[PDB]
Amino acid sequence: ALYEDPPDQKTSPSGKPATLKICSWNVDGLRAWIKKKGLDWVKEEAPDILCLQQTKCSENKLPAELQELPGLSHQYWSAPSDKEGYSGVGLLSRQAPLKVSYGIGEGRVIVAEFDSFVLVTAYVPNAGRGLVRLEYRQRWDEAFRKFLKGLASRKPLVLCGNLNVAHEEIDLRNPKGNKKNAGFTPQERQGFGELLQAVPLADSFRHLYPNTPYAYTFWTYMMNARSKNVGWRLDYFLLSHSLLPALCDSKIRSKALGSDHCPITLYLAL
Template sequence: MPKKGSKRNSDGSNENSKKKVKANNKKDPELKEAGDSNAEVVKTYPVKEYTSDGRKFNLKIVSWNVAGLRACVKKSGHEWMFESDADIICLQEIKCDAKNAPVEIKDRTDYSVHWNPGEKAGHNGVCLLSKTEPLSVKFGIPEKPEHSAEGRTITAEYDKFYLVTCYVPNSGRGLVRLEYRKTWDEDFRAYLKSLDEKKPVILCGDLNVAHEEIDLKNPKTNKKTAGFTLQERDEFKALLKQDLIDTFRKLYPDREGAYSFWTYMGGARAKNVGWRLDYFVMSQRLEKDLCDSVINADVMGSDHCPVTLLAALE
């Protein structure tokens, strides 16, 4: 979340710059306006339920940085989660353990619930809810225990794939954790490669990087902001070079204004001054099974919105 990386102006730019980038008013032909009052802000699109060869989805995964699970539930965010009827729900930045989690989540009987809260109370943490009990569940990067304390990842193994949900470390205000972020990225990349050698991988979560300039409102003024440094973007490129695909950009390479995070400052969400930080990345050999990768920008409850993957696994 860039808001933790550096202080930002209401236009989403770095505080050290006064430059602004004009909004691109180009209309997407598939765009549906979600109500006249929010027509230029809330963007929803027809959901594609079928693969390019006509197979209907049989797997639905939701991923959401809830910015505090208890706070999200108080805002009724959990209602959307379960109304989505997803097979798997992955949550990041939950900021609580199972003991202190809302009963609306931990007492669900239709999902098995798995927690990796991290050691520091009220910080970070991830949670995975699954209708089908995974074959195995692992926490952190198994071969790199030095990354385990912050509660960053859960890996669930299923018959046909591994699912990894992740809350990638933020490089911090003033980029004080940029070097640690590089180490994390390298170790995490190696871990995903080891999984992909066994089964296809689906990675989801807040990856704390806007990959290309199209993925944030004001790229020119954020080159030295956490989440858009050249190093972080290059590390993400290196990840994709491991025969992985960014599912959203694979389907929608030119779609603009598609963001999943908006700072609370300056009415950024109302102006759609945002960043695309939340992803579904999958093994390239699953591309044929991809139906849709959706940014649920109209769903409230956090400074991030959920993202959804639809796939038809054979």
């Protein structure tokens, strides 16, 4: 079954207008994504803040098109030192953040503090084929939760990006045949449930659309999975509970091409 994201809801449940638009995109190769016109899509989306994951690009190789985004002029990039062509994340913002830091105290995490909230974008480590990196993922999950818990102690938190797990069976097309697969192990799902519990956080999209199936943000390049919408929901906006009144909508931009992930977009009334 194909999926059609509902129209953008730009007013909070109470009736306040959205003032902040955040777009998160796992671009799977920033340079390839730019050549596949992904930045033309960003310009049409016109977000206040853009978070990118899996850029696979060091700062000295960023294409000059990125210096031509005047409404996203404050840019922060993080790549691994060891493995240049892998991982990597970026955060672009219309306004300067108050503070920016990297890591969770790998080029996987950027933390940016704004006036009324802290934003984290993450490329969560994949468990690997054959689950060869699942134990590392479990240790990483626990270190990440502890780091996030110790941030939400100040302002509310928005966490976005590729969290590399489909939380529940509704979050992927083939839950039964993938329960031993990276992204849908009981270990990764439980780690997600624990993140929501411990910090605490809510899944923005699931909060608004608790029963909507076939909503995915990732499709393997092979076996024409995307045209069949055989996909996984791996990309999220998770919010502190104190931000749920401010939540207008959480979108999945199914039609935007240029990666094996599609963009996601958050509308907040702050």
